Write an enzyme that holds these catalytic residues in place. Structure first.
Site, short mmCIF file in Angstrom:
data_model
loop_
_atom_site.label_atom_id
_atom_site.label_comp_id
_atom_site.label_asym_id
_atom_site.label_seq_id
_atom_site.Cartn_x
_atom_site.Cartn_y
_atom_site.Cartn_z
N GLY A 13 3.43 5.59 10.60
CA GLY A 13 4.74 5.44 10.02
C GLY A 13 5.40 4.12 10.33
O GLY A 13 6.54 3.89 9.89
N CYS A 50 4.35 1.01 9.54
CA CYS A 50 4.12 -0.08 8.60
C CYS A 50 5.43 -0.49 7.94
O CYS A 50 6.29 0.35 7.64
CB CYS A 50 3.13 0.31 7.51
SG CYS A 50 1.41 0.36 8.07
N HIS A 73 0.80 -1.21 0.00
CA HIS A 73 0.00 0.00 0.00
C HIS A 73 0.84 1.27 0.00
O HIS A 73 0.28 2.36 0.02
CB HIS A 73 -0.98 -0.02 1.17
CG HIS A 73 -0.34 0.14 2.52
ND1 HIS A 73 -0.15 -0.92 3.38
CD2 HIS A 73 0.13 1.24 3.15
CE1 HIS A 73 0.41 -0.48 4.49
NE2 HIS A 73 0.62 0.82 4.37
#
Ligand SMILES: *[C@@](O)(CO)[C@H](C[C@@H]1CCNC1=O)NC(=O)[C@H](CC(C)C)NC(=O)c1cc2c(OC)cccc2[nH]1
Ligand SMILES: *[C@@](O)(CO)[C@H](C[C@@H]1CCNC1=O)NC(=O)[C@H](CC(C)C)NC(=O)c1cc2c(OC)cccc2[nH]1
Lengths: 299, 299
Positions: free
Chosen positions: A141, A143, A39
């Site tokens: 932040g 991920c 993503h």
């Protein structure tokens, strides 16, 4: 006993940041490939209902900004595998450890290296719940932060971070992009199934108590595995698998208490309660220490 | 919200093994000096009552075997600073981080890198207890393991491990070799002073619980600072100073809960118990998060 993470250094040397447009997250640089959540290619508006195959066709190698610190790594190829993006870069990471990608089972523990903009921030132990969530500590932040175990300097990567559920627990994938649990990488409120207690880990805890001389709960009974599993489920405990029985083998040998005898002891605990007593000082039965964790800390 | 250690990589690159005769422990290799507990020079008989200056004057440089991974470092000189031995080696550690030696105050937290035979094994967070012990996890061969904090790539070393008390808590020195607490590096059973609970940390942790969406323990009452301190001392809690109140300022601003309002909540928890309820998963009041720990993790 306490939650002990693995030394994080071998993973720290693998963390990079990956930016697409204004979207930045973390990536894992092993040999000449960087792995990260797919993503990253989404605009904050496109995350609401993304079409990843169509979004990825609009992307080229030169759309991807991969940075080790502030040093750019040139991207020379890209592909998608389930929910992870794989960016081929032109430099093999000289700090790549011996490594494996493994998919863990509920109950297994691992160390999480929480990262922001490619920079490691902290390390802690997590357990995979039976509902395939973990009780992490993750901010915006985070991920692309990874979870791992280290065996004889070989790093087994098992988790890549993707999402925080509305209940505040966390969900993610293995390093082949396959989610643990029924979650999907969309910007949507998702709920996990009702959780259960990790029986194999509770048994590991009881063995740890016995190792340390705390054995009042040992009883004169035994049980079959099937009879135990049927009772366990009525107390919201996980059924045991054959694999659970076998990973309790070392602790069973060390203490001389057969696995099914320990199951009968837990069964009595479940039906009558601790009756005001403690085990290892605690009134609660702990379910986040695996048999390996117990051996690691006791011996 | 989890107990979170600093990433250990900068420290891992400094751990070595130090051997004198049949005695082995861990050392910390920074630039061209290895720091380790001085009792490495003692044989099993010496350790009962060692005259350290007398024993050290009798050792030669070549009595010290220092191993970094597989490579042996040649000791080219040695000095003693309190309970710490400083072995000069002929090779500088290329992985030396920017670092400082600091003596921490009771109530402050640090990360421990537990090591065996010069190899890092696990990482976890500890607090310096008011009685100058730490509640760690250390086994045989863990001496010389270090505790540290990290701030913008600078490692502040604060703890070197020396002993396990009969109660199972741990004792050690700063990197200048001075013990925390009234302990001595001899092979005797040593008791600590009566421990107390770190009040400012319990309050910070209650704020952490509120930042994470748990409010059940709040109440509509307030208390004065002195009245709170009277009850706190009655329950073997450390006094709360006006500096503590100020240090908790940001957490009170973030949550809109006046510090003395939270003191009233803690007073009620102390007088009424938790009644089987839990805060952030714990059945006990937690005192090993500092205000900075909460702020750093929650934001
Ligand atoms: C990543 O870092 C994204 O790069 C972020 C990590 C979380 C931010 C706060 N704490 C975290 O663990 N992940 C997300 O923001 C993901 C992105 C998806 C997988 C594309 N989304 C969520 O975790 C998410 C979305 C929603 C939601 O919507 C509407 C409603 C409720 C919860 C929720 N979580
Ligand atoms: C070191 O690794 C020594 O190199 C060791 C670490 C402990 C072993 C078990 N867990 C640990 O944390 N430290 C010691 O063995 C020290 C050595 C001193 C400083 C010379 N000794 C003790 O921790 C010790 C001695 C005694 C004792 O005597 C008699 C009686 C009771 C407790 C006790 N602890």
């Amino acid at each position: 006993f306490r939650k002990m993470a693995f030394p994080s250094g071998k993973v720290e040397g693998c963390m990079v940041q990956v930016t697409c447009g204004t979207t930045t997250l973390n990536g894992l640089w092993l040999d000449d490939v960087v792995y990260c959540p797919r993503h990253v290619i989404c605009t904050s508006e496109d995350m609401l209902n993304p079409n990843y195959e169509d979004l990825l066709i609009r992307k080229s190698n030169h759309n991807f900004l991969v940075q080790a610190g502030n040093v750019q790594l040139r991207v020379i190829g890209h592909s998608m595998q389930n929910c992870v993006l794989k960016l081929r870069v032109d430099t093999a990471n000289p700090k790549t450890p011996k490594y494996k990608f493994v998919r863990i089972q509920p109950g297994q523990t691992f160390s999480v290296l929480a990262c922001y903009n490619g920079s490691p921030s902290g390390v802690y132990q997590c357990a995979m719940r039976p509902n395939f969530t973990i009780k992490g500590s993750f901010l915006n932040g985070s991920c692309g932060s990874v979870g791992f175990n280290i065996d004889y300097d070989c790093v087994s990567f098992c988790y890549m971070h993707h999402m925080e559920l509305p209940t505040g627990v966390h969900a993610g994938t293995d390093l082949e992009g396959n989610f643990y649990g029924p979650f999907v990488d969309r910007q949507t409120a998702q709920a996990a199934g009702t959780d259960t207690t990790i029986t194999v880990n509770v048994l590991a805890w009881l063995y740890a108590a016995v190792i340390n001389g705390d054995r009042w709960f040992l009883n004169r009974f035994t049980t079959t595995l099937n009879d135990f599993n049927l009772v366990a489920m009525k107390y919201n405990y996980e059924p045991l698998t054959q694999d659970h029985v076998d990973i309790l083998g070392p602790l069973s040998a060390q203490t001389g208490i057969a696995v099914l005898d320990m199951c009968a002891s837990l069964k009595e605990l479940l039906q009558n309660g601790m009756n005001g007593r403690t085990i290892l000082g605690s009134a609660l039965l702990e379910d986040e220490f695996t048999p390996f964790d117990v051996v690691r800390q006791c011996s």
